[PDB]
Design an enzyme around this catalytic site. Structure first.
Site, PDB file in Angstrom:
ATOM      1  N   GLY B  20      37.915  38.591  47.336  1.00 53.02           N
ATOM      2  CA  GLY B  20      38.554  38.233  48.581  1.00 53.02           C
ATOM      3  C   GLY B  20      39.655  39.211  48.936  1.00 53.02           C
ATOM      4  O   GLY B  20      39.831  39.561  50.106  1.00 53.02           O
ATOM      5  N   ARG B  24      42.599  43.935  45.402  1.00 55.30           N
ATOM      6  CA  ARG B  24      41.971  43.889  44.087  1.00 55.30           C
ATOM      7  C   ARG B  24      40.758  44.803  44.070  1.00 55.30           C
ATOM      8  O   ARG B  24      40.499  45.480  43.071  1.00 55.30           O
ATOM      9  CB  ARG B  24      41.596  42.451  43.682  1.00 55.30           C
ATOM     10  CG  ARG B  24      41.166  42.316  42.192  1.00 55.30           C
ATOM     11  CD  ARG B  24      40.802  40.875  41.712  1.00 55.30           C
ATOM     12  NE  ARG B  24      41.680  39.881  42.318  1.00 55.30           N
ATOM     13  CZ  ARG B  24      41.269  38.906  43.127  1.00 55.30           C
ATOM     14  NH1 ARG B  24      39.976  38.746  43.390  1.00 55.30           N
ATOM     15  NH2 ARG B  24      42.158  38.083  43.662  1.00 55.30           N
ATOM     16  N   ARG B  43      39.763  46.278  59.785  1.00 53.99           N
ATOM     17  CA  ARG B  43      40.588  45.093  59.570  1.00 53.99           C
ATOM     18  C   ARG B  43      41.331  45.135  58.241  1.00 53.99           C
ATOM     19  O   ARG B  43      41.735  44.083  57.725  1.00 53.99           O
ATOM     20  CB  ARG B  43      39.751  43.805  59.681  1.00 53.99           C
ATOM     21  CG  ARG B  43      39.239  43.564  61.096  1.00 53.99           C
ATOM     22  CD  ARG B  43      38.143  42.488  61.242  1.00 53.99           C
ATOM     23  NE  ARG B  43      37.866  42.343  62.668  1.00 53.99           N
ATOM     24  CZ  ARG B  43      38.412  41.414  63.438  1.00 53.99           C
ATOM     25  NH1 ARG B  43      39.205  40.513  62.904  1.00 53.99           N
ATOM     26  NH2 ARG B  43      38.155  41.386  64.739  1.00 53.99           N
ATOM     27  N   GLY B  89      36.420  36.574  41.758  1.00 56.44           N
ATOM     28  CA  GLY B  89      37.499  36.041  42.552  1.00 56.44           C
ATOM     29  C   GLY B  89      38.519  35.271  41.734  1.00 56.44           C
ATOM     30  O   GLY B  89      38.580  35.358  40.505  1.00 56.44           O
ATOM     31  N   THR B  90      39.347  34.521  42.449  1.00 63.01           N
ATOM     32  CA  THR B  90      40.319  33.630  41.839  1.00 63.01           C
ATOM     33  C   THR B  90      39.997  32.195  42.230  1.00 63.01           C
ATOM     34  O   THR B  90      39.283  31.939  43.203  1.00 63.01           O
ATOM     35  CB  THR B  90      41.759  33.987  42.243  1.00 63.01           C
ATOM     36  OG1 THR B  90      41.938  33.852  43.664  1.00 63.01           O
ATOM     37  CG2 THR B  90      42.058  35.415  41.837  1.00 63.01           C
ATOM     38  N   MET B 180      36.970  29.100  47.445  1.00 58.86           N
ATOM     39  CA  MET B 180      36.759  28.994  48.881  1.00 58.86           C
ATOM     40  C   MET B 180      35.630  29.861  49.411  1.00 58.86           C
ATOM     41  O   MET B 180      35.512  30.008  50.633  1.00 58.86           O
ATOM     42  CB  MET B 180      38.046  29.328  49.637  1.00 58.86           C
ATOM     43  CG  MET B 180      39.221  28.410  49.318  1.00 58.86           C
ATOM     44  SD  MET B 180      40.690  28.665  50.334  1.00 58.86           S
ATOM     45  CE  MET B 180      40.095  28.155  51.984  1.00 58.86           C
ATOM     46  N   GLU B 181      34.775  30.429  48.556  1.00 60.54           N
ATOM     47  CA  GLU B 181      33.722  31.286  49.096  1.00 60.54           C
ATOM     48  C   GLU B 181      32.376  31.155  48.405  1.00 60.54           C
ATOM     49  O   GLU B 181      31.356  31.469  49.040  1.00 60.54           O
ATOM     50  CB  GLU B 181      34.151  32.765  49.054  1.00 60.54           C
ATOM     51  CG  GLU B 181      35.343  33.123  49.953  1.00 60.54           C
ATOM     52  CD  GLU B 181      36.661  32.864  49.281  1.00 60.54           C
ATOM     53  OE1 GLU B 181      36.679  32.792  48.035  1.00 60.54           O
ATOM     54  OE2 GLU B 181      37.667  32.694  49.994  1.00 60.54           O
ATOM     55  N   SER B 203      43.712  31.399  38.579  1.00 63.08           N
ATOM     56  CA  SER B 203      45.028  31.860  39.018  1.00 63.08           C
ATOM     57  C   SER B 203      46.005  30.725  39.265  1.00 63.08           C
ATOM     58  O   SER B 203      47.214  30.964  39.353  1.00 63.08           O
ATOM     59  CB  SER B 203      44.907  32.669  40.308  1.00 63.08           C
ATOM     60  OG  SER B 203      44.265  31.895  41.314  1.00 63.08           O
ATOM     61  N   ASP B 204      45.507  29.513  39.422  1.00 60.59           N
ATOM     62  CA  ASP B 204      46.332  28.343  39.636  1.00 60.59           C
ATOM     63  C   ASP B 204      45.759  27.251  38.756  1.00 60.59           C
ATOM     64  O   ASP B 204      44.551  27.210  38.519  1.00 60.59           O
ATOM     65  CB  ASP B 204      46.327  27.909  41.105  1.00 60.59           C
ATOM     66  CG  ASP B 204      46.732  29.031  42.055  1.00 60.59           C
ATOM     67  OD1 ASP B 204      47.922  29.071  42.429  1.00 60.59           O
ATOM     68  OD2 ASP B 204      45.875  29.868  42.436  1.00 60.59           O
TER      69      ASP B 204
HETATM   70  O1  HPA Z   1      44.077  26.754  44.081  1.00 60.98           O
HETATM   71  C1  HPA Z   1      43.179  27.293  44.748  1.00 60.98           C
HETATM   72  N1  HPA Z   1      42.456  26.643  45.747  1.00 60.98           N
HETATM   73  C2  HPA Z   1      41.476  27.308  46.462  1.00 60.98           C
HETATM   74  N2  HPA Z   1      41.214  28.640  46.205  1.00 60.98           N
HETATM   75  C3  HPA Z   1      41.928  29.282  45.230  1.00 60.98           C
HETATM   76  N3  HPA Z   1      41.893  30.548  44.748  1.00 60.98           N
HETATM   77  C4  HPA Z   1      42.819  30.652  43.773  1.00 60.98           C
HETATM   78  N4  HPA Z   1      43.452  29.463  43.616  1.00 60.98           N
HETATM   79  C5  HPA Z   1      42.907  28.613  44.499  1.00 60.98           C
END
Ligand code: HPA
Ligand code: HPA
Ligand code: HPA
Ligand code: HPA
Ligand code: HPA
Ligand code: HPA
EC number: 2.4.2.1
Lengths: 233, 233, 233, 233, 233, 233
Positions: B20, B24, B43, B89-90, B180-181, B203-204
């Site tokens: 995304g 990166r 973009r 991704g993350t 989200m993808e 990442s979270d």
């Molecule tokens: O916490 C998240 N939510 C949705 N997409 C993400 N991508 C990294 N962390 C998140």
């Protein structure tokens, strides 16, 4: 601090212009603002603060689609305290009453997304802009001589599509063009009590099959940019 | 030529890594590729081509959310003839069986989007990756000593949410994380007959409330990057 | 004890093969197992326990459709503690890449049922099998010389249908065949933390209009049966 | 000939009783019919033809759930020319106005299935029985002294559920019990112009938590069986 | 001639005021118009034509709810050639920013109806008024000293409801009041290319529990009536 | 006292006839009742109480569409304690088995409204009449020599429609005619524990394109009126 925005609270003025293209955001910062400062650049999504005719104004990219747009304007409002958001984007015309580079003011944003049903108890959320802001766009456009095409847009999750008669049906219901963020902008701003409006210039025409180039989608809309700056003054 | 991609047909190798974050993508191009060339930058969404251990490999950003992701991989496949797409991704962990910076291989992508119902006659499209590619990730990870957390992810149109028990329900159904993808990547690749897989590093963490910083979301995932390069060799 | 299963807790081994047809379950018990015991027979839905190459293995019918299938695998897991479930069913081919009696491994199960929306907050649940089990099927099939057609299936509530282009659309999205239980099996197993996989042999071909007979739907799939037994060993 | 039914055209009389349990079908054939003949047995799903008080009558199992039920009654009508179908099933009481082994006549079948939306343009199909048949059940029951509980049932895709207040809501809307086929029976018969009715005896009581045993679900409903035979005479 | 309207083509001026209550329509005809003529009275639903300050103006009742409203404005436009429709109705306040007898201008109408999904390919139709008409209401109100509360309304199929937090959620998304026709008026007018706007005075307050009487719902809104007449001049 | 009904508690007998047209309600009051009293007239929606053959009976208009109908029967039951409601309306025939002025008894009411999904957890509510009432209509009709066409109706939110094959599909599923209230009447009465039934005479024929006049929709249905009065005696 958020995952997607570099700035510090206070780097955004309470009024912000938005584009999907951060290079259109950057083009506005260079050419139209006085002493513009790059305040955020996570994921290459640039935002700026500057002055126009002495008035402070911020710029911010929001990427493509409702989900991307929603991330940025949720952060702009909740974290950075932005109160007025004016998207100045691109769209694909489905009406023969509009041509390439016409400016469309979206007084409603229909959508094929599920985001508003998720927000709103699986009912139909009528995604609309702030009324004073659209009043402000209308008077500024007339006080400047800019012809404004006024109507609904269809905010889609899709750019590419084999649909055909669905476009006739949208046009039959007074939708002037298709884009991909207005409904998310409007709904997020309704949720978070900010004032939002979306203008979009015609970069593609689905009837005539005309399409601007990537750089023309940056450069060909200066009356849209001027209208937005003049109303944020 | 497309509205969103600068490159020429032939500038993309048939195998492409995706993130995304175009920064990166750029970090992988600088640090891990040999003689990487920036091939697209509309973009600010950067793509590159290069060589890894002598093998040609491309990189491409896709922005945030299903709608953005779908635009880029539709163009990558239909215009640029890309045949294999590997998102790295993350994601946000909802399982206590995974920690920050674990790598998750998504063998299914649930979603709250309407895009797949629109694609698929309002039925339930089970958005899944290519099987050989996931086999390839599994063997490369084991041949390299990389621990791979395997399961479903939930691809949402939302990053910010007050939900709570919905996350328990997702975890109860063996969803390891939220991103989200993936579901859009998988469905577009199914439509267009390309091979796709999504890996995502944590990442979270929604249980422990840990969250990496913007730059850590670029820098903290080198085993993910190495795994992706090694399997595209 | 349940309304639908006669056995006692402990009569099922932790690994179970499943068919919709209890007479195919019985055929496997007679021909392929050593000292198979009929352990349940409510509603004529037979289940067995036995040994294959010394390893204990159970068999169980699940009837036709998601609702029937869900009843039995919910009971098998929650009451009888079954941990691994391997459906070996029949399906109707919609791809010209598969013929009568090909074996299909379903790495995702799309559906026209509402059951997963009811389970999953009206979102899209991506119904997928356990990954290790599908890895296990892939290696056992290759170690035995069995050609395995790998892809998605569409689990329908309907067997008879006047649809035509809906089948083209399913095939366009890489669905190899239509059956009627995989999505329920996968979702129930996700809910209850069991490992599940679905194989299905082609008994009908919707393109060529070939169709096996009732007894051929019992007898014509011995490589499927052997693959299932060999991987449960 | 069909994939699921062994009989020959002409082996079914134009009037047929149905149960989910083929062993209840068999129990009726042995105990209540004169010279009953087993006419079909695919998948262990038994059907019979016989005579009651000199009148020819058929019996047929349909398995559990709408999808299974729909397969059999679609074949019974389109292939075997059955004109009247009378389900005599089991159900779970949600009303305190009914007890174990009460007989419920379903004058409407609500459902959580998607099958009728798929059949019916995503509208609400009101799944109802034939009126003359329900008139016939009412008069035969009164002419025999059988107390008939009359109302709607809820046809679910689920037998096991953690719902609680959803059951109160169903009861509030005059639903007497939950079962799993009536809505499919009614809709298929509407599609194919046959006359259908569903009676169900209470085998489970969701308020009092009473539940019959597997064999009691065969043996405890002889007034239901007698009512069905008497009205088909 | 239609089933629901008595008038002859030409009895309606191109501009029409609308109420749900035909007795409010009649009250406006008697008290505010010059030489008003009753032109239609099917089903007791009265319409009139008259003059206000020399300008011709029609009045028409539309009953309660989207379905009723849609019948009348479909006929008014397609048969009677009405070009501008201005509803002046009643609504139930859900905002503490509005009191009894405040006038609300609805710049969007959300809904729990299915009518717009049926009209619009199961997407979200953003039901909005004509922009010039709302501009006209805004200037006339300010030129007359009338305070206009501007925002979205929620058009429901229900008047009576046990909901509670759903109202908080509507208020959170800037919905000022609940009524029952605006979304149908707006969508029908979009379909048929007429200009429509809805004003509604607060007759019920869902926070304070105040409620006007039937006759007060006729008599208490003369500034609304005057505003509507003044803008149609 | 309610916003929509003038009467006092006790002015309605426990049994009430209903029409959409308050002038048909008034026609029944004048011509068929003894000493009928107008008891309510808000919004010109007339209701009456009177005696028929010595038995007390009330009449009430309910307007057009589910939303309007629901308002009135919710008030009739909850406030005025009405226990039996018998709609005698008009409908548009979609079957060639019925002609102009045939009387249809609706034993189920399908719908394109969202009201029942909102009421009923987004499931399919099978909207049905009270069984004793329909039994009562059947015997009274036969004891009077009135031919009663029995089947489902489709309750739509729309009167005007370009659909064509949707009508064939409704007819294929045994729907005799289209009207606009039965499903709301049935569902509200189920919610509030009243007994309801809907009869409708054919005023429009969608196959032959015949259509009665506004006054004929009042005057042409006296056998329907007589049947309703005779069964409420
Ligand atoms: O916490 C998240 N939510 C949705 N997409 C993400 N991508 C990294 N962390 C998140
Ligand atoms: O054609 C389009 N479709 C969607 N969004 C757009 N933005 C510019 N053109 C378009
Ligand atoms: O053709 C089919 N359709 C659905 N299920 C099946 N199982 C075998 N063949 C089929
Ligand atoms: O409790 C039940 N639920 C669904 N179907 C049933 N059939 C008998 N009992 C039940
Ligand atoms: O409270 C209300 N709800 C819906 N419509 C209304 N019209 C006036 N008040 C109301
Ligand atoms: O044709 C019709 N459609 C809907 N309702 C009706 N009521 C009488 N005729 C009709």
């Amino acid at each position: 601090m958020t995952p997607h925005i570099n700035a510090k609270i206070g780097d955004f003025y309470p009024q912000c212009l938005l584009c999907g293209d951060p290079l259109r955001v950057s083009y506005i910062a260079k050419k139209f603002l006085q002493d513009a400062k790059e305040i955020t650049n996570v994921r290459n999504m640039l935002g700026f603060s500057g002055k126009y005719k002495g008035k402070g104004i911020s710029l911010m990219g929001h990427g493509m689609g409702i989900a991307s747009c929603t991330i940025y304007v949720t952060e702009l409002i909740k974290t950075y305290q932005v109160k007025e958001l004016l998207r100045i984007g691109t769209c694909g015309a489905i009406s023969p009453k509009v041509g390439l580079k016409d400016i469309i003011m979206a007084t409603g944003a229909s959508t094929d997304s599920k985001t508003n049903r998720v927000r709103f108890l699986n009912h139909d959320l009528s995604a609309t802009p702030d009324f004073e802001l659209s009043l402000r766009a209308y008077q500024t456009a007339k006080r400047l001589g800019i012809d404004l095409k006024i109507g609904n847009v269809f905010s889609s999750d899709f750019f590419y599509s084999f649909e055909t008669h669905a476009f006739d049906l949208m046009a039959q219901y007074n939708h002037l063009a298709i884009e991909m963020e207005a409904a998310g902008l409007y709904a997020t701003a309704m949720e978070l009590n900010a004032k939002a409006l979306c203008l979009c210039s015609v970069s593609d025409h689905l009837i005539t099959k005309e399409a601007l180039s990537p750089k023309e989608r940056i450069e060909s809309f200066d009356n849209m940019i001027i209208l937005a700056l003049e109303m944020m003054s």
